[PDB]
Amino acid sequence: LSPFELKDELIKIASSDGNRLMLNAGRGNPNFLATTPRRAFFRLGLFAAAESELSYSYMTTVGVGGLAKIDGIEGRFERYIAENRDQEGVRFLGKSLSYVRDQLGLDPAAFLHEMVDGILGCNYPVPPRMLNISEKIVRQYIIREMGADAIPSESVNLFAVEGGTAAMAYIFESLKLNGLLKAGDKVAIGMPVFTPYIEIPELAQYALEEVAINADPSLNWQYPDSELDKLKDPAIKIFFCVNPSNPPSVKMDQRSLERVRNIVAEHRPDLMILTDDVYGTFADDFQSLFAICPENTLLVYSFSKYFGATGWRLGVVAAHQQNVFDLALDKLQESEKVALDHRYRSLLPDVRSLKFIDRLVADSRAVALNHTAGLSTPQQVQMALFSLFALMDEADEYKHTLKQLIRRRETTLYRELGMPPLRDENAVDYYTLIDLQDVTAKLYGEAFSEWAVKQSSTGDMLFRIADETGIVLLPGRGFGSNRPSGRASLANLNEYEYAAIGRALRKMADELYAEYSGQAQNL
Amino acid sequence: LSPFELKDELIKIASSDGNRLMLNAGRGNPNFLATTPRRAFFRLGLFAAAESELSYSYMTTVGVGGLAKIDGIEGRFERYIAENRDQEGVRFLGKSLSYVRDQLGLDPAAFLHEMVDGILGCNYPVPPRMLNISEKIVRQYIIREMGADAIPSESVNLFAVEGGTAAMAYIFESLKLNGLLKAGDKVAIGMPVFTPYIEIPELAQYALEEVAINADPSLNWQYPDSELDKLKDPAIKIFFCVNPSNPPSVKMDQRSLERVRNIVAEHRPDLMILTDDVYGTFADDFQSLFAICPENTLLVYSFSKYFGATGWRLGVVAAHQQNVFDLALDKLQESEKVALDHRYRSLLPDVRSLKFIDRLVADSRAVALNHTAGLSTPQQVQMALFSLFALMDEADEYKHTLKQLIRRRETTLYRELGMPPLRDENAVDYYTLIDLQDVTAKLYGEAFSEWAVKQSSTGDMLFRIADETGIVLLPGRGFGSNRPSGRASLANLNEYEYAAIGRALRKMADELYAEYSGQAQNL
Amino acid sequence: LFAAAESELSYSYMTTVGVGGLAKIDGIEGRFERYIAENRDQEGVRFLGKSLSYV
Amino acid sequence: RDQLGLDPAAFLHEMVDGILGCNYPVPPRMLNISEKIVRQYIIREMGADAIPSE
Ligand SMILES: *Cc1c(COP(=O)(O)O)cnc(C)c1O
Ligand SMILES: *Cc1c(COP(=O)(O)O)cnc(C)c1O
């Protein structure tokens, strides 16, 4: 049948917000979430409300408060912390003050006030790009989880945005407005990638040409040298990539990372790299292209999956202080610079000094509104708390818990399918590939496996499952329609449901085997 | 001296986030805030965290939770409410369930779950435009505070956005992408208005022509018929207006509202009205242009000032089900419709049916990302709580408290300036006009008043104050430089500070009077 | 006392004056069960509890 | 501290040392901050809406 037609139909046999999200946005919404940093947030909120009431000078029963005062805040916070040792979030808050004060060396009072004033949401974000201390806390978390083990923290700047969704919207419009990406420009895209990232560059607002950098199934979905080398083409202005990938769900290996490193150093020092690494924490020793080529990369990191915070809309765009986007802006034609000089005039005197990452902020809200732009303060505070939570968990227990949960769901799913496929060191598996050829092969041998692959189709497979379980899987994309296969997220369902997907597929395979047995036995 | 030059200088003699906000964004950040709905929010958060932990099936000390279950939620919420009657926010939550259940007639379980799942921020907003029940709660609040006492609630749709700041950015880009506003188009602007709203239409992204609709000082800053009539010009595609106004801070009277009503009904049924009414709740019996011409108006309402929530970034764009923006989209050239048919193809089959307010959503995040667009769920939940708070306060006590606070600050400011100017029925006074002519006139008579106005200048006045108090006021704009005058917000400072502005200005006036006395006495 | 509480949950507006609404029959058993369990040390409540069973 | 703009610690100390009644009134005419608080009440209740506090 057809791909962009099978999606429309599937949404029918099985309707659900989850199934629609998977089909409409190619995302698996996590059914788990970090609770400790959230309780810490709500508890910090009860402390901040008390701080606000201490500042309202008149008598009322209405419920009005003033701005929290920074003076003596460490004392009052410590009183609050001591008086509520038996509440989880509270213990967390208290330790987080120590982490910021003792391990990061920041001003403790400043920290508490930013969080307090922050969570009350009674002041416009300042600076608009990101709250001062929250920016330093979050980048510490970013640098660590991206495996950017060589980039000094002071060199990374962050722009807080409402998720990777806002991030991409911002980045594409800014690149276009600053003439760093013009129509007809070639944008290399790591493939396969989910639908959304294929349609923006296809928009008429941009009109970009796509150069596919196809992953190779026989290489466990890594990018082969020959494919990565396609970047040496000087006509390719930007490398758009999701890593760990979606849907293959694997992280680029060392080979692939070094490959790109060389390509940038010896052939393309002008190449712009745009990488979405939301799944990084689900991989084992993840390293981002941002860690490898910091000055050629705009890193888009979302807090959505790891923290089970898709609803909080929390993300950051990271850029190295010295980067190719500012250089390209420097190299624009005087003609163009004058034009930009008039766009960001109301911002600063020397518009030519205005950094790219800051134009992102300016651009996000029609420039003239730059001073009331930025992510809400309560969201930034929750973002910093999520960050502290991961940074303070030295033993990575939360991370181990989630990887163990993923694997438990995988074990349940492949119970009647011949056990889960062999794991690699690049395996992430937030999404898992259910390939009819591999399953039948494990169950009844290579011979049957080959016959089956010709008798069935992805449509057949997905329909059979959607029918018997109500779950709609993602068609397997990336390797010539010659292989019936679908994808499931191990992050959005419960055990018995995976158990049902498997049971449904084992039935399907036994049916094919019965047919195959009856046929060969007619020789 | 100069206006766009005096701003740059003032930011020097006195530096502060408050002074910068007033100068850079023409806004007075409230030093007050609604505490009850915020405590209610944090308390709802502790309840939701418990609901989440009830859904995690394994043993850990890490702090992981699952999705809250809707079944039996009314029972558990009621247990929570009964067990915490002594906490303010809790009492509020409980009553809010009744308001939604008994006065709005919505599903109680649905309500609780939306709030619970909402505050946990573990799911993508759905629908992207706005959470179902939050949309019905907030529009009830909007319709009431806008004085839209004749528009059935079912006819108003809302799009939750991150403040009026995001709203305007969205609306201008959407109008341009859908060809409802093209370059060279005439946009009428209610003046005076703060700087930000003057620079967007001036952007090269848009390139619009401004037709000023000047308010008349002698009319207490209302718009005279002759000025409003300038809208009959068929070349004026959109009327851009802030009401209650900033900086004059008055609400359009009945005359002005009816005037525009007729202009739309008998001459311009195709005119698009874009109104920002954030200050509405500070006026007495406010009525929005949206209440008067619902089908010709896109209402932008912010929760920032009234709730002292500038940091939460909460706002909504309201549109009537049947409106001129969709009609104009219907009237576009087939040529154009085909072009749009390809922009929003991935959204729906019959793109021509896609309503304008929904294109706002689609446009906000590059279309392809429409399904993960929308305001974060926790913000929407806080927005609904703020709304319920105002709706449940039948006696408008919170509102009276804030109007009384405003007036107290005004009384303190004009103590040594001859008492505050006479109040009108259209007076809002979130910002107050300190006019040297009126003050001197009240203090030493009309004669002196006239001599003084020629001896001084706005620069002089603002510098004298900035010097002696550290507070930088807003130059008085709107009536020919012939009148030294500045503006202060009665919402961002404390009593003793207003007391100091006044003391500084009385000194200045006495000095002018001493000179004037010495002169005339030489006849 | 339990009814007083029930009525108060039905008043949808904010006031300190002390006005209640009509008790709702939905979910009444659970709310009553909570009230019984929280006041096992009050004679009257133990009796109320038994009454529900008898009926 | 917020509306009158006086020193909070000084205020608290005057009230605490004051109510303990362990020090002679100083200065004799009236305690420094009490005078400023009370005069703001006086001016207001006597309708002296134009007289400067100081
Ligand atoms: C799930 C997902 C995200 C999350 O989008 P947010 O707007 O950040 O919630 C980002 N990128 C990819 C590839 C995803 O799978
Ligand atoms: C203060 C103000 C607002 C608030 O902007 P938000 O982005 O909604 O915080 C809106 N419009 C005007 C005219 C203002 O004065």
Chain A residues within an 8 Å CB radius of D3: 57
Question: What are the φ/ψ torsions at residue A299 (nearest 5 degrees)?
Answer: -90, 130
* Residue B5 one-letter amino acid: E
Please count the structural domains in chain B. 3
Host H or E run for residue C35: helix C28-38
Question: What are the φ/ψ torsions at residue A272 (nearest 5 degrees)?
Answer: -95, 125
For residue A215, count CB atoms less than 10 angstroms from its CB and return exposed for 0-12, middle for 13-18, buried for 19 or more: buried
Helix (H, G, I), strand (E, B) or coil at A184: coil
Q: Are residues A342 and A251 in the same domain?
A: yes
Question: Two tokens at B497?
Answer: 């500070």
Q: Are residues B39 and B120 in the same domain?
A: yes
- CB contact under 8 Å between D3 and B496, yes or no, is yes
Q: Are residues B350 and B386 in the same domain?
A: no
For residue B241, count CB atoms less than 10 angstroms from its CB and return exposed for 0-12, middle for 13-18, buried for 19 or more: buried
Q: Taking a C-beta distance cutoff of 8 angstroms, is the pair B176, B229 a contact?
A: no
Q: Are residues A276 and A258 in the same domain?
A: yes
**Number of Cβ atoms within 10 Å of the Cβ of B385:** 26
**D5 is annotated as contributing to ligand binding:** yes
Interaxial angle between packed helices B377-392 and B36-53, expressed in degrees from 0 to 180 and rounded to the nearest 10: 130
Q: Taking a C-beta distance cutoff of 8 angstroms, is the pair A216, A227 a contact?
A: yes
Gap from CA of A358 to ligand 2 centroid (Å): 22
CATH, residue A486: 3.90.1150.10
Q: Are residues B282 and B235 in the same domain?
A: yes
Q: Which domain holds residue B288?
A: 152-372
Q: Are residues A87 and A118 in the same domain?
A: yes
**Number of Cβ atoms within 10 Å of the Cβ of B182:** 12
For residue A248, count CB atoms less than 10 angstroms from its CB and return exposed for 0-12, middle for 13-18, buried for 19 or more: buried
Q: Are residues B384 and B346 in the same domain?
A: no
Can you give the three-state secondary structure of A323-368, one letter per residue? CHHHHHHHCCCHHHHHHHHHHCCCCCCCHHHCCHHHHHHHHHCCCC
Stated in angstroms to one decimal place, the resolution of this structure is: 2.5
Q: Are residues A358 and A422 in the same domain?
A: no
Question: Two tokens at A148?
Answer: 């950017």
Ligand number with the minimum distance to the CA of B168? 2
**Cα angle vertex A182, ends A176, A184, to 5°?**
140
CATH, residue A383: 1.10.20.110
Cα gap B26→B165, rounded to integer Å: 13
Strand partners, A316: A160, A301
Cα gap B472→A182, rounded to integer Å: 44
Indicate the top mutation candidate among B22, B24, B27, B245 to test ligand 2's pocket, ranked by most ligand atoms within 8 A of CB. Answer: B27
| Farthest CA pair distance, chain B | 97
**Number of Cβ atoms within 10 Å of the Cβ of A365:** 25
Give Cβ neighbours of residue B509 (< 8 Å, ≥ 6 apart): B417, B436, B439, B440, B443, B444, B452
CA distance to partner chain A, nearest, from residue B102 (Å): 23
Q: Are residues A328 and A339 in the same domain?
A: yes
Q: How many CA atoms lie within 13 A of B186 on its CB side?
A: 12
Return the closest-CA partner of residue B279 out of B496, B125, B430, B460.
Answer: B430
Q: Are residues A189 and A105 in the same domain?
A: no
Distance, C-alpha A365 to centroid of its chain: 23
Q: How far is CA B289 from CA B147, B156, B249, B390, B429, in A?
A: 10, 14, 16, 21, 20
**Number of Cβ atoms within 10 Å of the Cβ of B425:** 12
Which of B395, B427, B446 is a domain's end point? Answer: B395
Q: Which of B78, B81, B103 sits opposite C12 (nearest CB)?
A: B103
Q: How many helices (H) and strands (E) does chain A have?
A: 20, 12
CB A164 near ligand 1, within 6 Å: yes
Q: Taking a C-beta distance cutoff of 8 angstroms, is the pair B314, B162 a contact?
A: yes
CA distance to partner chain A, nearest, from residue B321 (Å): 26
Cα gap B17→A397, rounded to integer Å: 41
C42–B contact, CB cutoff 8 A: no
Q: Are residues A157 and A260 in the same domain?
A: yes
Host H or E run for residue B489: strand B485-489
Helix (H, G, I), strand (E, B) or coil at B225: helix
Cα gap A419→A429, rounded to integer Å: 15
B54 DSSP assignment:
T
Q: How far is CA A401 from CA A282, A406, A423, A488, B63, in A?
A: 11, 9, 18, 20, 10
Q: Are residues B113 and B101 in the same domain?
A: yes
Pocket of ligand 2 (CB under 6 A): A 372; B 27, 163-165, 194, 242, 246, 276, 278, 302, 304-305, 310, 315
CB A277 near ligand 1, within 6 Å: no
B106–C contact, CB cutoff 8 A: no
Cα gap B364→B366, rounded to integer Å: 6
